Design a protein around this ligand. Structure first.
Ligand code: NSS
Ligand code: NSS
Ligand code: MG
Ligand code: MG
Ligand code: MG
Ligand code: MG
Lengths: 434, 434
């Protein structure tokens, strides 16, 4: 390959050097007698100056016709100039038009289009600066997670997607024909991580999880990226510490690296700066009391939906935990609170600013009889979970874990109006394409 | 949590120190008047010495009954002793039996069981040393990939799994009901990576890919982990360099870190040591000539199946490329060789020692008309690929990419007899459970 110079590399210190840009036309404007093409690539935008008396009439005329997203190779000499973007521009010697474009269907400012148009053209939308910014933030949060997980001694595993068990209820299961059998798409890798702790003790996975959720909210996708941890020996309080340490490191690392991207989306970084341990912790009992005190008609035992969480966040300026939920609005696998068996040892981590739940986790039931009984009480067939029950027969240990919704976290970090914008190609009940 | 000391931490230099082990009984043997329990955890095995006159009769009797996989907490004093495993043992002061076990259904040496028993009990099999070793090698190869990808300036993206397009043919597609519509499980994220290069230039993803492959071979799963790269500006030769640099770094890094694990599986590390650029490259034409020279009844235009690849590997002592395949045994998206349009600019990377294909990649067709025509020739509906065709309308650039089968790579690195052992919970046409 003939090497390119990235836009971010075009700096005043390269004054007088030859560079080869490769990218796409961002804007095309005649300035005096010259054509100024701003060329975008993955790293920034550079001003390329095209002079008729330098490139000749043929190239000059071609340059006039280059609309947004025209693919081009540009060779020229860098000139330091305090007036140009980045304090340096390229004086064009040669212009190769790969493909001229005049009708790119995403507007120059995407937010002047209907969100439905942007989704119809999601494959084109993702190359635009804000959409690309979201993907850079996403990769950085995940890289940060992997740094923390490696340093803290967790093992990465690669759990199954095709499964036969519901982890998070039958209502959100996708079912498919699988040769002579039927399979489900995994809602969560948790049950498999629980098997894996017996060999590896501290495990984690990042997998797509699948939820056939009919409700079309701004916090639900039908497919999302799910970062999940499970650890032998740890109780609920232990796993909550892991959660706050991990989330804080993810947020602080992304603040350090992606400030520019975050500032495209936020006027106020306060809640992100505030994201360091210890996070505030309230019981579900306290949550009910707070909600009732603000006039919300909620009763002990009621589910905390998105609206309840939203009101609860008003009292917090960083992520916070709610723990000790009523047993019967919580998953079959969660351990009872031994001090109060009406509750389970579960906690959710809620993001502030109205965002609500980003992590759900718990200590797991480690007693065989108790777990079997919960399976039966929930109308589940123990046959489908015999392997999971085996984990309580062959050297059971106390253990706990959690799942973080990556898109949910990105949506809070960037104050997105909908979780769909944090997925590369979002999936919702009416959206499968592109 | 009360902190534990890991087995690998029990070293002669801790002589006289109190430690708390937490783990599972590996073996239980009476030695003289004492009970020797070898305790395994995620990091190794430690000899714990239980003396009746120290722990008392009740604890001593309990210790006699502890079979393999009994979950235990052991507190005691480290004693340096050249005779013990690791040169240090723990003299037990306190023994807490969490759960006693006497009938763990995986044999002490798993390979004395039918592979079908091991798969029936896959959830139990994975905690055993060799199976756990494979997972450590897998996480290390992947960590190595991420190190290389970050250093070389690639962006991580998180592409969709629910899709409407076949990338790699209709025959291996899983189809499912999706609300009022139908969806497919992604065979490969490639088409979406191609969309993503327009914003991010150099992209990669690690995703589960799904192949409804009826043939039950030792190189096919119905679900596998697929590491895929796509890059703007790069041609086939460029992407081949990326492939050899990445694979070499993965292998060399895993050799550096996981020598102990690899030596459980290999007598000979030669081919791994040999895995550094430049890898040997032969044309498909040369491959046919080699095969015919060894008496294989293959003709130019024929598909190279597993058996052909196996024979071809006899001539190589490290991974190697085969390039320039006949157009009509290759995918619809691949770019024709401009020098010879009977061929496409595709290459596979084959592992030696009979293993064969670990990567398939190509330069992509970047001409709209040519791609449309190939879609139509293959009996595909261009409507299902309109978005993919858009990538050839709105600033097309030359580009290339590839997919690496992680399990396929693990199977070669560890000389596994079947790819299934490199998946945490393998999926094959008759195996969906556990
Ligand atoms: N390993 C575990 O302990 C996780 C546990 N099995 C689990 O799946 N919990 S969860 O349903 O709360 O999902 C966990 C998180 O996953 C996110 N989530 C959960 N459902 C969705 C949907 N439908 N869309 C997007 N994101 C979703 C959200 O952040 C939740 O807090
Ligand atoms: N992004 C790309 O350019 C990849 C391209 N779309 C692709 O899917 N190619 S491939 O079919 O050869 O699959 C790529 C690799 O994926 C592996 N593979 C491909 N199929 C399987 C099955 N069924 N089981 C396990 N592993 C499999 C094998 O290592 C192949 O070399
Ligand atoms: Mg809830
Ligand atoms: Mg939840
Ligand atoms: Mg082939
Ligand atoms: Mg192939």
């Amino acid at each position: 390959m003939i090497e390119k110079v990235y836009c971010q590399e075009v700096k005043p210190e390269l004054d007088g050097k030859k560079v080869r840009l490769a990218g796409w036309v961002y804007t095309n404007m005649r300035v005096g007698k010259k054509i100024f093409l701003w060329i975008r690539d993955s790293t920034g935008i550079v001003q390329a100056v095209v002079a008729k008396n330098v490139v000749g009439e043929e190239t000059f005329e071609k340059a006039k016709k280059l609309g947004r997203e025209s693919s081009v190779i540009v060779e020229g000499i860098v000139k330091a100039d305090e007036r140009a973007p980045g304090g340096a521009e390229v004086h064009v010697e040669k212009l190769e038009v790969i493909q001229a474009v005049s009708e790119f269907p995403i507007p120059e400012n995407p937010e002047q289009a209907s969100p439905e148009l942007l989704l119809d053209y999601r494959h084109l939308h993702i190359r635009t600066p804000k959409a690309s910014a979201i993907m850079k933030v996403k990769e950085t949060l995940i890289m940060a997670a992997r740094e923390w997980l490696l340093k803290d001694g967790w093992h990465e595993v690669f759990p199954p997607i095709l499964v036969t068990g519901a982890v998070e209820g039958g209502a959100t299961l996708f079912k498919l024909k699988y040769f002579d059998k039927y399979a489900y798409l995994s809602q969560s890798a948790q049950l498999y991580l629980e098997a894996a702790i017996f060999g590896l003790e501290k495990v984690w996975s990042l997998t797509p999880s699948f939820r056939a959720e009919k409700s079309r909210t701004r916090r639900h996708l039908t497919e999302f990226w799910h970062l999940e941890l499970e650890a032998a020996w740890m109780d609920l309080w232990d796993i909550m510490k892991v959660e706050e340490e991990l989330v804080s490191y993810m947020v602080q690392r992304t603040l350090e690296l992606r400030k520019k991207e975050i500032e495209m989306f936020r006027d106020d970084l306060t809640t992100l700066k505030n994201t360091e341990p210890p996070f505030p912790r309230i019981s579900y009992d306290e949550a009910i009391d707070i909600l009732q005190s603000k006039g919300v008609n909620v009763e002990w035992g009621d589910d905390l939906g998105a609206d309840e969480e939203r009101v609860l966040t008003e009292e917090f300026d960083r992520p916070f935990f709610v723990y000790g939920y009523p047993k019967h609005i919580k998953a079959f696998y969660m351990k009872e609170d031994p001090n109060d068996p009406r509750k389970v040892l579960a906690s959710d981590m809620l993001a502030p600013e109205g965002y609500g739940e980003i992590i759900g986790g718990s200590q797991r039931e480690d007693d065989y009889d108790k777990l079997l009984n919960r399976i039966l009480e929930e109308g589940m067939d123990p046959k489908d979970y015999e392997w999971y029950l085996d984990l309580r027969r062959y050297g059971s240990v106390p253990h706990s874990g959690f799942g973080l919704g990556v898109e949910r976290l990105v949506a809070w970090v960037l104050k997105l109006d909908h979780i769909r914008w944090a997925a590369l190609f979002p999936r919702t009940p009416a959206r499968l394409y592109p």
